[PDB]
Amino acid sequence: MIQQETRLKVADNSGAREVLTIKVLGGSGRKTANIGDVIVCTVKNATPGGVVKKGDVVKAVIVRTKSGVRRNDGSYIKFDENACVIIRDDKGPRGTRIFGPVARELREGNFMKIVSLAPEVL
Amino acid sequence: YRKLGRTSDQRKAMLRDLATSLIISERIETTEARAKEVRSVVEKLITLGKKGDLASRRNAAKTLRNVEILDETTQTALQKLFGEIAERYTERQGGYTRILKQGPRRGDGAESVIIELV
Amino acid sequence: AVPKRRTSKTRKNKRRTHFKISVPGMTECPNCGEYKLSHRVC
Amino acid sequence: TNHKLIEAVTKSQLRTDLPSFRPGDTLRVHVRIIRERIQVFEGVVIKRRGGGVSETFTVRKISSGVGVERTFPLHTPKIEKIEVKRRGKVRRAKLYYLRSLRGKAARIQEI
Amino acid sequence: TKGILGRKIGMTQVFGENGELIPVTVVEAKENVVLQKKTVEVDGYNAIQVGFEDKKAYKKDAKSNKYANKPAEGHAKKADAAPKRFIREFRNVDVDAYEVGQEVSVDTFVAGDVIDVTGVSKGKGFQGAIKRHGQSRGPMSHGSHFHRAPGSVGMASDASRVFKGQKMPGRMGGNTVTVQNLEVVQVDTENKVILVKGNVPGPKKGLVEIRTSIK
RNA sequence: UUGGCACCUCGAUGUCGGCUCAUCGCAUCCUGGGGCUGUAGUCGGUCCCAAGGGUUGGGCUGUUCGCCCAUUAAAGCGGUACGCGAGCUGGGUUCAGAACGUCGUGAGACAGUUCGGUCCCUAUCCGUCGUGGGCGUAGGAAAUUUGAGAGGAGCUGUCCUUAGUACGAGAGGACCGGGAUGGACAUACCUCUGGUGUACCAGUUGUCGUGCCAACGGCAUAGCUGGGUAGCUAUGUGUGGACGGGAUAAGUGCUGAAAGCAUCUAAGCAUGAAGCCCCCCUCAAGAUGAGAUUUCCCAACGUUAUAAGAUCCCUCAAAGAUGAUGAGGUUAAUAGGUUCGAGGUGGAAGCAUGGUGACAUGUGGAGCUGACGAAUACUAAUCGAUCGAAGACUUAAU
RNA sequence: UAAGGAACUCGGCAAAAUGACCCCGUAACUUCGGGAGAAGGGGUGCUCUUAGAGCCGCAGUGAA
Numbered sequence A: 001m002i003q004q005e006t007r008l009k010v011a012d013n014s015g016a017r018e019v020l021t022i023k024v025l026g027g028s029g030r031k032t033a034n035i036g037d038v039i040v041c042t043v044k045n046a047t048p049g050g051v052v053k054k055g056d057v058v059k060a061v062i063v064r065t066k067s068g069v070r071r072n073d074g075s076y077i078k079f080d081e082n083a084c085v086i087i088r089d090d091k092g093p094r095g096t097r098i099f100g101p102v103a104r105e106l107r108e109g110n111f112m113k114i115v116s117l118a119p120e121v122l
Numbered sequence B: 001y002r003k004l005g006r007t008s009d010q011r012k013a014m015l016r017d018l019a020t021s022l023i024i025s026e027r028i029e030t031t032e033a034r035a036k037e038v039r040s041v042v043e044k045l046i047t048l049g050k051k052g053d054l055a056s057r058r059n060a061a062k063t064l065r066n067v068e069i070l071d072e073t074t075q076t077a078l079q080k081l082f083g084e085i086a087e088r089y090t091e092r093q094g095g096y097t098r099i100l101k102q103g104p105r106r107g108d109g110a111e112s113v114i115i116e117l118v
Numbered sequence C: 001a002v003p004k005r006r007t008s009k010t011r012k013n014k015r016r017t018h019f020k021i022s023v024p025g026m027t028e029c030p031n032c033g034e035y036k037l038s039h040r041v042c
Numbered sequence D: 001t002n003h004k005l006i007e008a009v010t011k012s013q014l015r016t017d018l019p020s021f022r023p024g025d026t027l028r029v030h031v032r033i034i035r036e037r038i039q040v041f042e043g044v045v046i047k048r049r050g051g052g053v054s055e056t057f058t059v060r061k062i063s064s065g066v067g068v069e070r071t072f073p074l075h076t077p078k079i080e081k082i083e084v085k086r087r088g089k090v091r092r093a094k095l096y097y098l099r100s101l102r103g104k105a106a107r108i109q110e111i
Numbered sequence E: 001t002k003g004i005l006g007r008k009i010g011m012t013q014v015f016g017e018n019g020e021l022i023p024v025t026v027v028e029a030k031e032n033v034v035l036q037k038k039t040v041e042v043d044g045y046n047a048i049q050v051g052f053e054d055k056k057a058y059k060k061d062a063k064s065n066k067y068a069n070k071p072a073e074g075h076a077k078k079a080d081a082a083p084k085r086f087i088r089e090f091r092n093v094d095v096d097a098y099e100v101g102q103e104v105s106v107d108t109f110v111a112g113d114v115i116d117v118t119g120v121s122k123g124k125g126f127q128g129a130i131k132r133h134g135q136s137r138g139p140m141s142h143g144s145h146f147h148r149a150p151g152s153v154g155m156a157s158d159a160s161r162v163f164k165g166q167k168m169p170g171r172m173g174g175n176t177v178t179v180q181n182l183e184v185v186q187v188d189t190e191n192k193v194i195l196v197k198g199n200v201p202g203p204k205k206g207l208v209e210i211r212t213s214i215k
Numbered sequence F: 001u002u003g004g005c006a007c008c009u010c011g012a013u014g015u016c017g018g019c020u021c022a023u024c025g026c027a028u029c030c031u032g033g034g035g036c037u038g039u040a041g042u043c044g045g046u047c048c049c050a051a052g053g054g055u056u057g058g059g060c061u062g063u064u065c066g067c068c069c070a071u072u073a074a075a076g077c078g079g080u081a082c083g084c085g086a087g088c089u090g091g092g093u094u095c096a097g098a099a100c101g102u103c104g105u106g107a108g109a110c111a112g113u114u115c116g117g118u119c120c121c122u123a124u125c126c127g128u129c130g131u132g133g134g135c136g137u138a139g140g141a142a143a144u145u146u147g148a149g150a151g152g153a154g155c156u157g158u159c160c161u162u163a164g165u166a167c168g169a170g171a172g173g174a175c176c177g178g179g180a181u182g183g184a185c186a187u188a189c190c191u192c193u194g195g196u197g198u199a200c201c202a203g204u205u206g207u208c209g210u211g212c213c214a215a216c217g218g219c220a221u222a223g224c225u226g227g228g229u230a231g232c233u234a235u236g237u238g239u240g241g242a243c244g245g246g247a248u249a250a251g252u253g254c255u256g257a258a259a260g261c262a263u264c265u266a267a268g269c270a271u272g273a274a275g276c277c278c279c280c281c282u283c284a285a286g287a288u289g290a291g292a293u294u295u296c297c298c299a300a301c302g303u304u305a306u307a308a309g310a311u312c313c314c315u316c317a318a319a320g321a322u323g324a325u326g327a328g329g330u331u332a333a334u335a336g337g338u339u340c341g342a343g344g345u346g347g348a349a350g351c352a353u354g355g356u357g358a359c360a361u362g363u364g365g366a367g368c369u370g371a372c373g374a375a376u377a378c379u380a381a382u383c384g385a386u387c388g389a390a391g392a393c394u395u396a397a398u
Numbered sequence G: 001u002a003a004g005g006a007a008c009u010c011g012g013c014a015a016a017a018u019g020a021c022c023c024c025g026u027a028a029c030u031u032c033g034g035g036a037g038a039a040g041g042g043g044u045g046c047u048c049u050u051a052g053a054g055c056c057g058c059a060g061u062g063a064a
Ligand SMILES: CC[C@H]1OC(=O)[C@@](C)(F)C(=O)[C@H](C)[C@@H](O[C@@H]2O[C@H](C)C[C@H](N(C)C)[C@H]2O)[C@](C)(OC)C[C@@H](C)C(=O)[C@H](C)[C@H]2N(CCCCn3cc(-c4cccc(N)c4)nn3)C(=O)O[C@]12C
Pocket: F012, F014, F118, F119, F120
């Protein structure tokens, strides 16, 4: 459950460490976003030498949330943190690695490169 | 359950007081709502007495007040409950109390009732 | 906050149409030949 | 019970091959994922709740340093098998205190 | 089309084909009987009257609705049925396919049928604009003295009145509500139960009317 | 709008912005329909019809406004005392303090600025939202209803396919259709995920009690802490609005004269919008025009007693401020108790064993358990009392 | 009080958070006194032996 001003860890090696959510995309009046949704964010904290730098306005896909998600079989998955991945327009990751587990809903979202690079897909 | 115009602790204390008073006197006059709550409290205490084991006695002592009852003998309310009252109700399956309405009080119009052991 | 006009006698009595009490619910007691409230004991 | 009609109409949905387990136990849950494969979720049971066909249980694991929790209805056909690997020693029904712990501080003693 | 009356028992869930969780409402629709057939020639419209949940027979000095009064008893005897607790009319069905006194069984519906369910929603008593009409609160701090009030109720000299239809506090719930395009999940002839996908209006034990969906 | 005028108000018509809640207009921002185009296509420009619905979250500023960030189908313009302070706020602006610049000999002052600075009111009438009582509806009554009329709802994105087809050197890339899935909104509901859960379970601190050990009770925010049933709930679970029929707008015509021809028009005949009337949901016969159907009841002398039927009173909850509604009142499961359960907690007390001891283990998924399910008349719904029609007249009738 | 965490607002107003004792450790600047409780970190229960060994809970200045 990600809204404007929510801060998210970045689960890739693109340079960004923490981002702040600027906008939840996908319609007028949309307030919250979850796993697989795309957000506009600003990089509040970055590591040295990364492609993505502090102060940049980028787009990211949410890959895990504390709220988690509910699947049609009545099962749920929840994570210990909110983490996102910086993406390009082609939905490919800007970084070259993905850290930590990501939700399988990314596959339905067509973030196949992220799913492939993830060390675990639950 | 009713709130009886009291906070939780006050209500619990009043219910313990009323139940012990009913055990001591076998018949008391109070308000209707008070009696409608006291009946459940007192009947559960009598159930504990009919059980009669040490655990049931200690559970009853959780609720009963420490009031002595004076043939110049002396016994506590818990003793009376686990002796005389339990023995009198050994063969009855619930319904140990009955409420009898009497009409409003002069001072505040409260519906006075008498609740007594059957 | 305050009445704009005084209330007429007519309006006051119309309002008081329902302001009354009812005779209590009472039944005869057999032995004593008196009356009591229904579902109450002497 | 619950309502007799509800119990009667949902009796057929209940499974009779699930092992007994309690919170604090480690389970391997073999979940069918679909190309139909089985993915094993191994972790500690932190909560069981509800009753009848509505009963659910939650299992928690640490995946690459990130806590993950999976909640399943007890009688979902999507679970192939449940194996009780370990029998933990706990003092309460809901192990929510494990969420804020990490490493050895999150260890659960065995029976 | 098709129609039946029942009592809402409660909510539960089932597992469908491919294992998806289907939340369902259990409706007990036993003891449904056609009491009357209204026609255009006599009543001016076509409908079937269905009674549901047999009640006790008439007795002298009955003090509650548990016992049929003499008008209700005569109405039921005309159909050769026991007096019923709930009586409702169905205009959607075709009256030429029913006889007076015939049972309306749960087997009338079939799994997969699309239905509309009507019932009286749960009562909530006197409620304010925030809950009843879903309005916004005023600020809870910053000196505010406006929290759950309804707000301005009109304009100035024009119009010097509050319009009809203004949203204000008042009794909430207890209204007839129709939920449309639900699905029948399962029909269980024994126990006379219909499982409706989703949820329906009203408290447990409340009367519900199941009809074939208009749309 | 800035003004002009000075006609209501100075025995008071509270001023800006914001919040809450809207409501109306159309010179239409989006969506729907259409003409022209310097309209190849995708996009645009302009004009006409169209007010059904929709029309944002932030940074700065008291701000309105405006600029900017990021969205969106779109972020329309106006009216309602520049809507709305007996609904709120009070940052700004007519107050007493103080200071700067400036003007003044001065007291003080300001096309200025700066820090600080009390927002009263128990609703009589109309109005509005709910909810009862009386009478009427030509007998009385129970239930089921028709629908005059009224209210609600009315939005829209993206993707796939048609089709990489039509068009186009190329780049690019359709209409018309057909499928899928969302955003916002509305509504119902607690199976699920969670919240709450002050008479549920457990752990724990200080202190005072129950004579002591043990076990418990009081108080400390429910002392605190970890869970949690019902109920109530959203952030949770379902459902709804892109349909169709009739009549139309701007348009487009067919046939067709006045006017030999031409011409959508003058008479005729079609077609044509998210708009109109229906379709969908809700209320509705005080619809005094008071409707309909089925069933029940039937007296004598205004009076007495009554019928069918209601109530009073009492036990209550799915209902509820109170009335009202619904479940029941002994020919009874309505509530309480009792017994058995579901769920919740998580292993009672006592005793035994092990340990120096704090403790541990076993008896034993134990003990306890508000609201949830069932069974059971043990307790209380006693006796009783009140109301309640007797069916008018006139005219026609196969 | 889920998720979020000043997006509220003129303004974090109000509330939340901090808080005791013991031990580590502490910057610019300075009128050399200060700044300073700067900041930031560790330990508190119970039992037994004479600093060790144990015991229990989600939590030990377990409340205020
Ligand atoms: C809080 C109560 C006071 O209300 C108000 O102060 C306000 C908030 F209601 C208020 O300011 C009203 C609104 C005022 O009226 C406005 O006047 C404007 C000029 C015009 C406007 N309209 C016509 C456009 C009017 O509505 C005025 C003049 O009160 C000062 C009304 C007149 C009749 C007036 O003087 C009245 C009598 C005024 N007052 C003097 C207080 C004088 C100041 N004060 C004294 C105290 C106090 C005294 C003792 C103890 C304590 N603890 C406090 N608190 N405040 C009182 O003792 O009581 C009230 C009612």
